[PDB]
Design a protein around this motif. Structure first.
Motif, PDB file in Angstrom:
ATOM      1  N   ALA A 129       0.837  -1.245   0.000  1.00 51.72           N
ATOM      2  CA  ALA A 129       0.000   0.000   0.000  1.00 51.72           C
ATOM      3  C   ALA A 129       0.860   1.279   0.000  1.00 51.72           C
ATOM      4  O   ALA A 129       2.073   1.217   0.053  1.00 51.72           O
ATOM      5  CB  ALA A 129      -0.870   0.027   1.231  1.00 51.72           C
ATOM      6  N   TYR A 161      -3.772   5.136   1.594  1.00 55.01           N
ATOM      7  CA  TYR A 161      -5.173   4.627   1.799  1.00 55.01           C
ATOM      8  C   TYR A 161      -5.594   3.426   0.909  1.00 55.01           C
ATOM      9  O   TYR A 161      -6.556   3.428   0.155  1.00 55.01           O
ATOM     10  CB  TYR A 161      -6.128   5.819   1.579  1.00 55.01           C
ATOM     11  N   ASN A 162      -4.806   2.402   1.070  1.00 52.56           N
ATOM     12  CA  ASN A 162      -4.983   1.105   0.339  1.00 52.56           C
ATOM     13  C   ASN A 162      -4.897   1.216  -1.181  1.00 52.56           C
ATOM     14  O   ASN A 162      -5.724   0.750  -1.946  1.00 52.56           O
ATOM     15  CB  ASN A 162      -6.347   0.495   0.819  1.00 52.56           C
ATOM     16  N   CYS A 163      -3.812   1.855  -1.536  1.00 48.97           N
ATOM     17  CA  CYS A 163      -3.419   2.127  -2.942  1.00 48.97           C
ATOM     18  C   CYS A 163      -2.008   1.561  -3.092  1.00 48.97           C
ATOM     19  O   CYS A 163      -1.295   1.555  -2.110  1.00 48.97           O
ATOM     20  CB  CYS A 163      -3.424   3.606  -3.130  1.00 48.97           C
ATOM     21  N   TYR A 206      -7.724  -4.802  -8.299  1.00 54.00           N
ATOM     22  CA  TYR A 206      -7.169  -3.439  -7.980  1.00 54.00           C
ATOM     23  C   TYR A 206      -6.202  -2.981  -9.109  1.00 54.00           C
ATOM     24  O   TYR A 206      -5.458  -2.036  -8.904  1.00 54.00           O
ATOM     25  CB  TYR A 206      -6.363  -3.476  -6.638  1.00 54.00           C
ATOM     26  N   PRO A 256       1.021  -2.022   6.156  1.00 54.00           N
ATOM     27  CA  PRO A 256      -0.357  -2.445   5.833  1.00 54.00           C
ATOM     28  C   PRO A 256      -0.465  -2.490   4.308  1.00 54.00           C
ATOM     29  O   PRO A 256      -0.485  -1.457   3.677  1.00 54.00           O
ATOM     30  CB  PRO A 256      -1.291  -1.403   6.475  1.00 54.00           C
ATOM     31  N   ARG A 311      -2.437  -3.582   0.644  1.00 55.02           N
ATOM     32  CA  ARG A 311      -3.855  -3.283   0.263  1.00 55.02           C
ATOM     33  C   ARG A 311      -4.586  -4.346  -0.551  1.00 55.02           C
ATOM     34  O   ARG A 311      -3.984  -4.966  -1.410  1.00 55.02           O
ATOM     35  CB  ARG A 311      -3.826  -1.964  -0.509  1.00 55.02           C
ATOM     36  N   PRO A 340      -8.701  -3.987  -1.154  1.00 50.29           N
ATOM     37  CA  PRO A 340     -10.123  -3.584  -0.884  1.00 50.29           C
ATOM     38  C   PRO A 340     -11.080  -3.847  -2.050  1.00 50.29           C
ATOM     39  O   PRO A 340     -12.151  -4.410  -1.937  1.00 50.29           O
ATOM     40  CB  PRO A 340     -10.008  -2.119  -0.556  1.00 50.29           C
ATOM     41  N   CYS A 352      -8.765   1.625  -4.663  1.00 50.15           N
ATOM     42  CA  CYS A 352      -7.886   2.419  -3.744  1.00 50.15           C
ATOM     43  C   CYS A 352      -8.742   3.633  -3.341  1.00 50.15           C
ATOM     44  O   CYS A 352      -9.716   3.940  -4.007  1.00 50.15           O
ATOM     45  CB  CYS A 352      -6.669   2.813  -4.551  1.00 50.15           C
TER      46      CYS A 352
END
Length: 64
Positions: free
Chosen positions: A7, A10-12, A42, A56, A58, A60, A63
């Protein structure tokens, strides 16, 4: 440690096209290896290999 889409904030991920860039990028965070991987869920990303635990990664869907 883990193998995953690393990541950024923010989860990118790092939409990279140079596996090598990853080979440097991931390990630079402390991964044991580094390659740019792509899927779709993604998009494209850097797949850090055996990336430490403090990063962390990613997964999700999008992103944000």
């Amino acid at each position: 440690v883990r193998d995953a889409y690393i990541a950024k904030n923010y989860n990118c991920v790092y939409e990279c096209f140079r596996d090598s860039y990853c080979n440097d990028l991931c390990t630079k965070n402390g991964a044991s290896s580094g390659y740019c991987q792509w899927a779709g869920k993604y998009g494209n990303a850097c797949w850090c290999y055996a990336l430490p635990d403090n990063v962390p990664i990613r997964v999700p869907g999008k992103c944000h």
